[PDB]
Amino acid sequence: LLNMRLRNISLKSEHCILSSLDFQTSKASEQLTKKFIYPQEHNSFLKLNFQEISYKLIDGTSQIELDPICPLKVPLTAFSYDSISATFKLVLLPKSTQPHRVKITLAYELELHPNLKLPVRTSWETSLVNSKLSNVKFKFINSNIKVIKGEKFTMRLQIINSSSSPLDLVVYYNNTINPITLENQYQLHNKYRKIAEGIILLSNDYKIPYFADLRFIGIMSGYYGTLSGLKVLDLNTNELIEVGNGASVLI
Amino acid sequence: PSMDIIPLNELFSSQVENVDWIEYVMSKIRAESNLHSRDFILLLLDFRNSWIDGIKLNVQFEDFTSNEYHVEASHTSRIIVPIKKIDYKKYNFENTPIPRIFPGRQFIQSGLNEEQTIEMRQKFWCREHIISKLKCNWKLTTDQSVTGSVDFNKFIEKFDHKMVYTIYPGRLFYGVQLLLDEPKVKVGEIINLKIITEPTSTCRRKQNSTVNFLDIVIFDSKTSKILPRSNRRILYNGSLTKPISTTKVSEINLEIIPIEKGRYEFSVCISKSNNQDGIIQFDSENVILSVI
Amino acid sequence: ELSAPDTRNDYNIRGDYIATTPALITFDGNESFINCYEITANNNFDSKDIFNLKVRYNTLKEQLDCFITDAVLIEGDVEWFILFEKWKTFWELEILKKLKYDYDAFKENRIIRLLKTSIDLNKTKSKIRNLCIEKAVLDKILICLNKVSRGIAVCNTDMDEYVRNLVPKQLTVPVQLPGFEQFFHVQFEQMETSHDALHDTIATIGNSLSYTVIVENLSGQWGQDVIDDGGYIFEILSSNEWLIHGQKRCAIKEKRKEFEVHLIPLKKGYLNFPRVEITNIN
């Protein structure tokens, strides 16, 4: 009851859940010690946090922070430190423990000594393109973020199919404007315009035959996150697989 | 088998001077300051052999000569050719294409209206322009003396509405450029702007509504245009509706003073009335400035 | 127009809108008319002066009524010699009940009347001594204006020096804040995802209350989100405030606050009170 603490956990896409703990001197404790300190004419407190650490599991391992941290001391403040946990594909929820050491130094070198230790579970409170029909999956083997200029470049698809008939699909980019509140109308027009002529495929209408190298050239500068022009058509039972993957900046 | 025509808007600064069209188009842009960018259109046509041996397939335009490609046996290889636009006011595209004979009556009650005839004349005479300069002069790699030419007349089939927009700007409704004084202006300064407007020969199509409404939109160079409250942004006198008229060389000159940042692009929009969904032309001249 | 008071500082209002070439506006609350003024601060701090404006205007009803009078029934001076110079006030009393359609007058039409009465107006003109040399013109003009539409051209040609412009005014006292601050921070982003190429905003805004605080929002990122945790070091210059954040994260919500209105305040150091918090993440 001197510094209220909370922990926030987020799930990054790079298979590393990041959990950040936040500490803040609570206002009720602030006024509680503040009137008794201002009786002796003190305006700013001094809670010296000298040893803050987090532990892992039933065997105690000290996972470090993401940056440096000295031994600080301040009043009426808040500070947050972020550790990087490991992403779990199973349903084993990791339970961690944190500990601090607040030295509540009253003045003229007459200090008290306080320590605290919480322990709880680091929950989070709740791409590979796959089709809807068959076993056919898509994933770009080369790193989906890429930094290019407006020059010629290459990109690499990959197909994991049912081995019964691996062939009979075609790719094409469809360089035409999709046929569409004037402000939202023109915003959707600018999205559909810079999609339809931003990059151009240097081999479209292209029969596939488990790799498939397909080659572009990029014209217009900008970050094309989930570049969604190219559209792999499946010949038999005529439907379309969108490929919402890959993101190329062109600067 | 197929063909498509796409324009370009980036300037293509150098060290990308290895790709065959880029040096020619940037050479024409580089000197001759009236020979500007933003109006070049690339045509994308795909050569595909049905043979057993490789070919070389050099493409000659009226002055553009491409590199030496290599199509092996059954593949496509999209050879990208630059071409400028064709000016509507300099030319005439509303005359009937002639027949060869003068003998037959040819069912002289022709079953066509006015506007269907005129769009048929446009669709024919645009490919009449783009065929009468295009060539190719091929050779086999393993035989080297079997060099022949090709035609294009039995290959290009027809156009659609997208090709006649992209090749011919006379199909559009207005012709606009922009004039800006200083593209590197400091923030405490107000700069006059200019929007020239020059209507088309498709102004005959409506003939009744003698006003159209030039909207103004503003977008951060990245994405996601700014709502017209324009705080932290361009501080602007007047309002962005600015009525213009048919058959007029009007100039809706405005003023613009920045607040925070640099990367701004300016463009227009034509909407034919003031209500929703009256829109006709999403005009896209889209010039840029900076504020340090 | 805009006018500067008698205190007479170096206020440089570069903004001054003159609608010389257009005699046109509309205020039907569909689009948004914004006027703006690029003023300057004084030679020192100056927080309470008085500004008064000058809007000339008209209303569009008597704009189209002036157009209809000057080019529908009194175009030439031949009819203006006799047929309307003896019944001008009667023409105004007839014109005041015209009630032209101002709902389709902003969409491809101008000077177009609504469905108002035109039957008993002929009987009302016939009741007085109105001669047929004017009763033909005053009926034919209303019959023409019952279904006609003009354009934006030849509107200023009727509006030119034929309208009393009510040059109204207002009062704008150029309101000010209370607690001046001057801070500058610096960041160093420990990258979770490599860089998301964020777009920046160096704010300048002051909080004006008592027992209050200054709350800041981080920069805006537009690539792959939820990441790029930015570390920071304060160097909170020229004051002694209270800080309430350390080594935040540039995702969905960070809100790196700074409790300001507690101790070590100052006066109005400028036109308003300021806090020119310029972060610099290099």
**Is A36 within 8 Å of A27 (Cβ atoms)?**
no
CB B222: neighbour CB atoms within 10 A?
Answer: 12
Strand, coil or helix: A117: strand
What whole-number distance in Å separates Cα of residue B290 and Cα of residue C10? 28
Please check whether residue B197 is in contact with residue B174, taking contact to mean a CB–CB distance below 8 angstroms: yes
Query: Measuring CA to CA, how many Å separate C109 from each of A226, B273, C148, C150, C248?
Result: 46, 10, 8, 6, 58
| Helix/strand/coil for B133 | coil
Phi then psi dihedrals of residue B148, to 5 deg? -130, 170
Q: Which A positions 4-63 lie with beta carbon below 8 A of chain C?
A: 10-14, 16, 18, 20, 24, 43
Exposed e or buried b per residue across B188-215, where buried means at least 16 C-beta atoms within 10 angstroms of its C-beta: eebbebebebebbebeeeeeebbbbbbb
Contact C241, C160 (CB under 8 A): no
Other Cβ atoms closer than 10 A to B156: 15
Residues 6+ positions from C39 with CB-CB distance below 8 Å:
C11, C12, C13, C14, C15
Q: What is the CB neighbour count within 10 angstroms for residue B170?
A: 21
Order of all β-strands in the sheet with A224-225: A145-147, A247-249, A224-225
Q: Which two tokens stand for residue C220?
A: 């805006």
Q: Which residue has the tokens 């200054």?
A: C214
What is the residue type of A164?
S
| Three-class DSSP category at C34 | coil
Which of A183, A168, B241 is closest to C22 using CA atoms?
A: B241
For chain B, how big is the Rg over CA atoms in Å?
24
Closest CA–CA distance from residue C259 to any residue of chain A (Å): 9
Alpha carbons C98 and C94: distance in angstroms, whole number = 7
Contact status of B246 with chain C (Cβ, < 8 Å):
no
In the DSSP assignment, the letter for residue B170 is G
Residue count (chain A): 251
- What Cα–Cα distance (Å) separates residue A44 from each residue in A106, B214, C182, C256? 11, 61, 22, 21
Number of Cβ within 10 Å of residue A26's Cβ equals 13
The answer to whether the Cβ–Cβ distance between C151 and B245 falls below 8 Å is: yes
Other CB atoms within a 10 A radius of the CB of residue A224 amount to 19
DSSP state letter for A14: T
Residue A169 and residue A231 in contact, taking contact as beta carbons nearer than 8 Å: no
Contact B273 C222 (CB under 8 A): no
Residues 6+ apart with CB under 8 A from B259: B187, B231, B232, B233, B234, B235
- State the greatest distance between any 2 C-alpha atoms of chain A, in Å, as a whole number: 86
Give the Cα separation of C250 and A101 in Å (integer).
Answer: 28
Q: Give the mutation candidate from B279, B283, B286, B288 for the A interface (greatest A CB count, under 10 A).
A: B279
In contact, B257 and B234? CB cutoff 8 Å: yes
* Dihedral, A243, A244, A248, B2 alpha carbons, nearest 10: 40
Kindly report the nearest CA distance between residue B274 and chain C, in angstroms: 6
Q: Which CA distances in Å does C167 have to A193, C100, C161?
A: 47, 25, 15
> Distance between CA atoms of B244 and C23, rounded to whole angstroms?
14
Phi and psi, residue A157, nearest 5°: -80, 170
Residues pairing with A48 in the sheet = A73, A103
The CA angle C101-C160-B191, to the nearest 5 degrees, is: 95
Which of B195, B208, B241 is most worth mutating to test chain C (most C CB atoms within 10 A of its CB)?
Answer: B241
Q: Around Cβ B160, how many Cβ atoms within 10 Å?
A: 10
Beta bridge partners of B6: B42
Residues 77-106, chain A, touching C (beta carbon < 8 A): 77-82, 84
